[PDB]
Amino acid sequence: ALAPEIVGEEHYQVARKVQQTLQRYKELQDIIAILGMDELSDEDKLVVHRARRIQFFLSQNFHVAEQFTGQPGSYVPVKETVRGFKEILEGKYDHLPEDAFRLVGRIEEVVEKAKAMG
Amino acid sequence: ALAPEIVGEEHYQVARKVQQTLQRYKELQDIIAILGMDELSDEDKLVVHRARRIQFFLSQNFHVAEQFTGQPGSYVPVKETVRGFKEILEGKYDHLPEDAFRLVGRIEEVVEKAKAMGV
Amino acid sequence: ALAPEIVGEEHYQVARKVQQTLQRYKELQDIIAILGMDELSDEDKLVVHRARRIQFFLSQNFHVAEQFTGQPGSYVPVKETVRGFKEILEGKYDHLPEDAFRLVGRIEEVVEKAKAMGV
Amino acid sequence: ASLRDIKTRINATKKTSQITKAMEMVSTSKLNRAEQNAKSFVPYMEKIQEVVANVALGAGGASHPMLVSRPVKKTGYLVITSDRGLAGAYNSNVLRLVYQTIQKRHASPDEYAIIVIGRVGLSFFRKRNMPVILDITRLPDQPSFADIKEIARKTVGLFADGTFDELYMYYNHYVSAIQQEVTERKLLPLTDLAENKQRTVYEFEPSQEEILDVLLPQYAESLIYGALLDAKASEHAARMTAMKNATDNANELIRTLTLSYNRARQAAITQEITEIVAGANAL
Amino acid sequence: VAGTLRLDLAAYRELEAFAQFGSDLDKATQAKLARGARTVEVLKQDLHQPIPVEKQVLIIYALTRGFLDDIPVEDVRRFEKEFYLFLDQNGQHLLEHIRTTKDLPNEDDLNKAIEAFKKTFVVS
Amino acid sequence: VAGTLRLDLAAYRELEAFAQFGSDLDKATQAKLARGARTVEVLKQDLHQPIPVEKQVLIIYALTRGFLDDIPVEDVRRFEKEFYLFLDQNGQHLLEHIRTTKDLPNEDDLNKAIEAFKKTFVVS
């Protein structure tokens, strides 16, 4: 179903960009292991900075996971998650800590978690 | 019919030498498959160099194949074939590129098309 | 019957060490056949060095094997073979050629057969 | 091919792939160390170049700075090679260039000699009919100046002694992890220097003849040292690239062999079940 | 202790084949290599000699907390064999606590007992 | 115009493999790589959008005669689209000649039309 004819041009582009960024991060894993992250070029470090946040934002708090975590669950619309991932890709939240993306619903919940963390 | 008393002594010797070089190349292909040609000794590198050119010169352009590729075909006498393969075995044309040996007839066409390309 | 209480602790340990050395050697052949012995570490080089000698010393000449070997056979007791394999594991005869261990019986015959080659 | 043979091939190729991947990682680490050593060597070269430029515009009566110290005669060749293979065309390119040059311009065994670093060069020139006078084989992965200063001193002293009247050095130059360029440099006699802040160096100006007797051999020794860091970096990069290529080839071969093994397994099951049913219904 | 043991064994089994090139000390991965080698030495066992669960827990705790990091792999079997006797001589309180409450004793007491045994264990 | 494209695409596909391994490729190899990349770009197509053979002939002619050599690779599809629009706008005579005669029109006229379109085309 991930085709622009039926899922939408914006959705398709955002998904492809996310997959490309994660593939680049996966490629950089061995060099990140062998040498410090500083050795990477500024572009590669920016790529890793985006990719870690995207990887954490892919997680979600489930309704049935309350028995494990105490916290409630979330139901995220597809348009909401597309807008959130687009904003993340555009660098809107590069200054936020990577742990604010850990387990949330909407993109606004990342901002709320960061504000609570201080 | 591949017997010295049927095809001739030099014909038989050239055929046997070609088969020997091709067998050696087939044996080496396993090593070239993984680690390339860098670790081969100077003898094996020369064997590969000769074998690739022999294998490419074994190709020919056919009259019937003119409908598929627009090139006209060729008819090669057995004496010319023996002379060409003996010359290739002797190392006369080691400096020519290996792509100049493809789909030609007599050994002179190899030189002609090598001259047509950069040389 | 290969148990410490059945055959003895020293025999059990030397047999287990021989088996471990041979098992280690078997894995190294796959990478040796491609990358050569030069890329092996100093430990693995010694492992191969001793394992080849152990494997060659595992050979023997049988009395009924005269028809096939010319040389007569031998009878090696268990204490003597355990002692010889212990010495080879300890590395007393690393300087001996590996061919000196072929169908020899005891290590005494190994060191005497080495004299025939000038070692 | 049988299932046993295919399985053995697959296992051997997997082991080789793992070994090559580990070698590639080690070579990457060594390349980084070589690069930082080459970075560290810069200030010594800068200061010695500045000093020599400041005092090489003087009377220059020494043998070394002469444009032609002695006429055409025996020529010394310095070559830098590795001690082990698996580096790709690293040794082959340099040896090919050296052989072509000495065949094209010398054409006589009496007028050329080879100074060789690395055992593969020894093997090459010994297999050929080549006279080699100075040898050095073992050398650390991160070489130091004092490691082969003892052979650099002999190399400069041979020119100072009149054994040969010309010096050339051939080595691989490190441009990138993929690019290694074979470089020829005219070593001796000294020919030219830089052009900035002229004369600053000769304020003290102690006697020139005595100072040049020691300053020059030092510049040559620094030149041989600069050539070894670049050679080591190029060797490490070439090893890394070759091991990466070998690992990729091994992975592709593993994939193809696995496909063939699965097809053979399916065919064997088909044959056994067909024979079973034919025998069962033949009654 | 099983969670740490599993991760150590996995990080040894993968990242294995670097041992030969890890002989040339690189990256401090040799720490993981040594921990994995000692874990493999600990997991070995003989015939018809089952170990009580409390002693298994104690030896795995000693391994996973780094008390074996300076004992060479050649001496791990002797360390365990003598540590069991030291336990049944001077750690009856810990053994009884484990057997009764099904839980680990105080980490301070565990460290005290392990250090007391380790100062008496002679390395050879 | 088709024979050059067919053999080139088959070979370019194997020369790119050498390009991926990394080598100091010559100028002829660089030109072959550029032409192969542009051929791969022009041979792509979208769903349910068939193209008339007359337009296909012109686009392949423009590819083969080097008129696309100075166009960046990422702009090839846009160049083809805008070229089709410009053809519908101005090259009715060439299109009708091809439809009627099943043969190429004047090569000078084709060159003039392509070089006229290239002026209105915008890079990047």
Side-chain angles (χ1 to χ4, degrees):
Chain A
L2 193 68
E5 278 74 32
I6 61 172
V7 72
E9 191 72 37
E10 177 171 39
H11 188 306
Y12 182 66
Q13 288 166 3
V14 172
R16 290 296 299 163
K17 278 197 291 183
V18 166
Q19 290 174 85
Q20 189 164 346
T21 301
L22 269 68
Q23 183 57 243
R24 180 67 266 201
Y25 184 29
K26 168 61 173 64
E27 289 288 328
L28 290 170
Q29 292 288 357
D30 283 331
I31 198 66
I32 289 168
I34 299 293
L35 282 83
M37 192 169 141
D38 52 282
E39 182 70 26
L40 283 172
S41 66
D42 277 10
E43 185 49 44
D44 293 327
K45 287 184 283 186
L46 188 150
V47 162
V48 173
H49 204 77
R50 294 285 219 285
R52 291 190 64 77
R53 283 169 171 66
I54 292 162
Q55 188 181 28
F56 284 129
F57 192 64
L58 282 164
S59 297
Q60 189 167 344
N61 55 325
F62 280 178
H63 301 74
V64 305
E66 180 188 306
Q67 66 200 13
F68 305 119
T69 57
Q71 66 181 350
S74 311
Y75 177 90
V76 184
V78 63
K79 55 95 175 178
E80 282 301 323
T81 192
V82 166
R83 187 184 62 84
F85 273 98
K86 194 183 64 169
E87 290 181 23
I88 290 171
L89 284 164
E90 290 178 337
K92 289 266 285 189
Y93 309 108
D94 293 334
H95 54 285
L96 266 65
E98 69 181 29
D99 286 346
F101 302 81
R102 184 58 60 90
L103 288 170
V104 299
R106 309 283 185 100
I107 186 56
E108 280 70 28
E109 293 173 47
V110 183
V111 183
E112 297 160 13
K113 187 162 177 164
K115 184 57 171 73
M117 286 172 155
Chain B
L2 188 65
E5 73 278 356
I6 305 178
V7 293
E9 271 286 352
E10 64 184 299
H11 188 279
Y12 185 67
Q13 297 308 319
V14 169
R16 289 314 191 197
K17 279 299 302 185
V18 164
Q19 285 180 333
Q20 190 182 59
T21 65
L22 292 178
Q23 174 64 40
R24 190 52 189 145
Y25 187 32
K26 195 177 72 162
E27 290 171 8
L28 290 173
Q29 274 160 25
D30 269 355
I31 300 103
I32 296 89
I34 286 188
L35 56 82
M37 216 174 301
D38 302 308
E39 294 303 315
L40 297 186
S41 75
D42 288 335
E43 281 69 26
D44 296 312
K45 280 191 290 279
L46 189 62
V47 174
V48 175
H49 198 82
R50 297 266 172 79
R52 272 190 154 266
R53 281 161 177 67
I54 286 165
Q55 183 185 44
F56 287 146
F57 191 58
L58 282 165
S59 291
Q60 189 169 340
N61 49 325
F62 282 169
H63 301 281
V64 169
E66 184 168 7
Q67 69 198 277
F68 310 125
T69 126
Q71 201 193 6
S74 67
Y75 184 99
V76 184
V78 65
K79 182 62 65 68
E80 302 278 51
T81 307
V82 174
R83 180 176 63 86
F85 275 101
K86 195 190 292 184
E87 289 183 44
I88 297 172
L89 286 167
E90 286 186 310
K92 271 192 64 183
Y93 307 108
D94 286 340
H95 54 289
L96 268 70
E98 66 184 51
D99 275 344
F101 290 80
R102 302 162 139 252
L103 305 139
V104 288
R106 278 172 231 221
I107 193 64
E108 281 71 38
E109 309 194 54
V110 185
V111 181
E112 287 285 79
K113 88 177 289 182
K115 188 172 293 288
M117 72 179 71
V119 66
Chain C
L2 192 78
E5 64 274 2
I6 310 301
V7 71
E9 202 81 25
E10 179 178 38
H11 186 149
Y12 181 71
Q13 296 304 327
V14 66
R16 288 310 193 197
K17 287 173 73 78
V18 168
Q19 292 192 313
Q20 181 184 358
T21 302
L22 286 160
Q23 173 61 36
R24 182 50 187 154
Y25 176 47
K26 193 199 296 186
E27 298 160 14
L28 297 174
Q29 286 174 36
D30 296 343
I31 66 160
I32 282 163
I34 297 296
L35 304 172
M37 268 287 279
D38 287 330
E39 303 310 316
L40 277 297
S41 75
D42 293 9
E43 171 79 351
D44 299 301
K45 283 170 176 157
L46 184 65
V47 167
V48 171
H49 186 83
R50 287 179 186 169
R52 265 200 165 257
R53 284 164 170 68
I54 282 166
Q55 179 67 282
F56 278 179
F57 185 55
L58 280 166
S59 313
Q60 196 169 338
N61 55 327
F62 287 173
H63 297 73
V64 295
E66 287 194 321
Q67 319 163 97
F68 313 124
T69 65
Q71 56 152 324
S74 64
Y75 186 96
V76 186
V78 60
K79 301 181 180 289
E80 278 55 43
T81 189
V82 165
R83 183 194 64 96
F85 276 100
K86 170 168 289 291
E87 310 298 328
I88 301 170
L89 275 172
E90 299 278 46
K92 183 171 296 292
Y93 312 116
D94 278 343
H95 54 288
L96 278 301
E98 64 186 60
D99 189 53
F101 301 85
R102 290 281 201 116
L103 291 82
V104 292
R106 295 97 171 288
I107 49 172
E108 280 59 40
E109 311 190 72
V110 165
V111 300
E112 300 303 325
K113 180 175 171 73
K115 302 304 181 71
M117 295 189 283
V119 172
Chain D
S2 74
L3 294 170
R4 317 208 293 267
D5 314 308
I6 303 166
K7 184 66 68 172
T8 59
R9 287 204 66 198
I10 291 165
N11 282 106
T13 315
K14 285 175 174 184
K15 290 309 297 283
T16 304
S17 173
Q18 291 178 343
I19 295 299
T20 56
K21 182 65 193 290
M23 294 180 74
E24 180 200 342
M25 313 285 267
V26 170
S27 297
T28 302
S29 81
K30 289 187 178 185
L31 172 59
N32 287 112
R33 298 180 210 284
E35 193 166 296
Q36 72 88 59
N37 190 0
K39 286 190 295 188
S40 304
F41 183 45
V42 173
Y44 190 79
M45 273 302 296
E46 175 57 30
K47 73 170 279 273
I48 196 169
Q49 187 89 345
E50 176 196 285
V51 169
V52 169
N54 277 272
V55 207
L57 245 325
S63 178
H64 294 310
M66 276 199 274
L67 275 301
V68 176
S69 304
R70 294 178 291 269
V72 176
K73 195 180 76 178
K74 196 183 307 287
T75 295
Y77 282 76
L78 173 72
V79 303
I80 313 182
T81 62
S82 64
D83 282 310
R84 292 178 297 127
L86 279 71
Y90 174 87
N91 301 296
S92 81
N93 293 339
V94 172
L95 276 297
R96 281 190 308 105
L97 175 66
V98 167
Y99 191 87
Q100 298 305 327
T101 296
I102 65 186
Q103 290 293 106
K104 74 175 287 183
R105 74 177 170 200
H106 270 258
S108 174
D110 315 320
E111 48 192 292
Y112 71 89
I114 297 89
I115 320 289
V116 55
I117 308 143
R119 75 174 66 253
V120 64
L122 281 72
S123 299
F124 182 97
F125 287 113
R126 287 211 197 264
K127 185 169 73 174
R128 270 77 173 175
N129 58 5
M130 291 297 178
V132 184
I133 53 174
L134 293 175
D135 301 330
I136 178 64
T137 302
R138 294 293 175 91
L139 188 65
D141 293 331
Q142 292 329 285
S144 188
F145 191 88
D147 301 345
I148 54 169
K149 194 270 294 186
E150 63 173 49
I151 201 66
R153 197 271 296 176
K154 299 181 186 91
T155 304
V156 308
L158 284 184
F159 178 89
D161 197 26
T163 70
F164 42 82
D165 302 351
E166 189 71 49
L167 273 298
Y168 288 101
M169 66 177 169
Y170 301 83
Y171 64 102
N172 285 288
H173 164 63
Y174 172 66
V175 184
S176 73
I178 313 300
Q179 181 82 346
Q180 285 77 241
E181 299 199 2
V182 176
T183 293
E184 174 184 51
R185 275 184 62 85
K186 185 179 178 178
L187 165 66
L188 288 177
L190 184 143
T191 299
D192 201 13
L193 262 333
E195 213 182 297
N196 113 96
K197 233 348 147 268
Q198 289 216 138
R199 283 338 229 181
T200 20
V201 263
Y202 85 144
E203 314 248 325
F204 345 102
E205 225 342 282
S207 298
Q208 214 134 330
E209 283 96 278
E210 294 97 282
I211 63 169
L212 266 293
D213 191 47
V214 291
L215 179 73
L216 290 176
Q218 240 133 86
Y219 181 88
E221 220 156 33
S222 86
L223 285 206
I224 157 254
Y225 189 50
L228 189 66
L229 297 188
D230 207 1
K232 298 303 289 180
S234 300
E235 188 198 334
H236 293 138
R239 284 179 189 291
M240 177 183 76
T241 295
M243 294 296 100
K244 179 190 179 292
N245 291 341
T247 310
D248 298 351
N249 295 337
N251 290 339
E252 177 65 20
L253 180 56
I254 284 156
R255 189 184 66 82
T256 52
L257 285 172
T258 306
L259 288 172
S260 80
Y261 175 85
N262 281 325
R263 293 192 304 256
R265 176 192 65 89
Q266 287 183 27
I269 294 164
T270 305
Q271 192 204 339
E272 73 170 0
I273 191 52
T274 296
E275 290 173 0
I276 286 297
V277 176
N281 67 52
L283 277 296
Chain E
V1 295
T4 302
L5 186 85
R6 163 173 316 278
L7 307 189
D8 282 358
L9 208 54
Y12 183 59
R13 291 301 178 184
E14 77 170 359
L15 182 68
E16 201 270 331
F18 268 91
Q20 291 82 44
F21 308 147
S23 81
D24 290 284
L25 72 165
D26 296 328
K27 173 173 244 200
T29 299
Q30 40 192 348
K32 286 181 187 221
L33 266 53
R35 177 61 64 84
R38 284 170 176 73
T39 304
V40 172
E41 288 286 351
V42 168
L43 293 177
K44 290 179 180 174
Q45 192 165 344
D46 283 327
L47 273 172
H48 307 327
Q49 296 178 359
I51 310 309
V53 61
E54 60 270 10
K55 288 176 176 173
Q56 302 187 41
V57 167
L58 292 175
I59 192 65
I60 296 169
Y61 177 91
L63 170 74
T64 51
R65 296 305 195 266
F67 291 90
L68 305 191
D69 284 354
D70 46 42
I71 296 90
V73 300
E74 291 81 16
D75 277 357
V76 174
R77 305 291 295 279
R78 306 199 308 106
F79 187 102
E80 179 176 347
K81 190 192 78 79
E82 291 183 28
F83 181 55
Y84 287 160
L85 296 171
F86 179 94
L87 282 172
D88 55 54
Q89 282 264 10
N90 313 317
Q92 287 290 352
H93 56 293
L94 310 171
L95 296 172
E96 289 164 5
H97 179 81
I98 294 161
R99 285 192 294 248
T100 53
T101 71
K102 263 68 180 181
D103 200 6
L104 278 165
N106 301 313
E107 292 88 348
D108 298 332
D109 295 328
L110 281 172
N111 299 356
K112 284 170 170 72
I114 293 161
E115 286 292 341
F117 166 74
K118 190 171 170 179
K119 82 166 183 173
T120 71
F121 182 70
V122 57
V123 177
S124 177
Chain F
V1 283
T4 110
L5 273 225
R6 152 127 258 169
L7 250 335
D8 302 349
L9 197 74
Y12 166 76
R13 280 305 187 191
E14 54 84 19
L15 192 152
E16 185 200 2
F18 304 137
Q20 295 301 135
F21 282 118
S23 183
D24 207 6
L25 298 177
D26 298 317
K27 60 96 177 179
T29 54
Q30 289 162 31
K32 294 179 72 68
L33 280 172
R35 190 58 71 83
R38 285 168 171 76
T39 305
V40 170
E41 287 294 338
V42 309
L43 290 189
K44 289 179 184 170
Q45 199 166 337
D46 288 349
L47 280 165
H48 306 96
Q49 294 187 2
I51 300 157
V53 66
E54 49 264 22
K55 289 185 173 78
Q56 303 187 35
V57 168
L58 271 77
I59 191 60
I60 306 302
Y61 173 91
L63 170 71
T64 306
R65 305 308 174 82
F67 287 87
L68 269 64
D69 276 341
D70 59 354
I71 304 300
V73 177
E74 285 80 20
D75 284 344
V76 166
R77 302 196 73 177
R78 212 186 85 241
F79 182 98
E80 176 179 5
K81 184 192 184 81
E82 291 196 49
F83 184 48
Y84 286 166
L85 302 170
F86 168 88
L87 285 177
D88 281 341
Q89 199 72 31
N90 299 109
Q92 293 287 345
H93 57 291
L94 302 180
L95 294 183
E96 195 53 47
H97 180 278
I98 283 167
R99 294 176 194 153
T100 305
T101 68
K102 309 304 191 292
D103 194 19
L104 279 174
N106 306 307
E107 292 185 306
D108 298 334
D109 295 335
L110 290 174
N111 298 358
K112 290 285 183 70
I114 295 158
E115 79 187 35
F117 166 72
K118 288 188 70 171
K119 292 181 172 75
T120 76
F121 188 64
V122 56
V123 184
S124 78

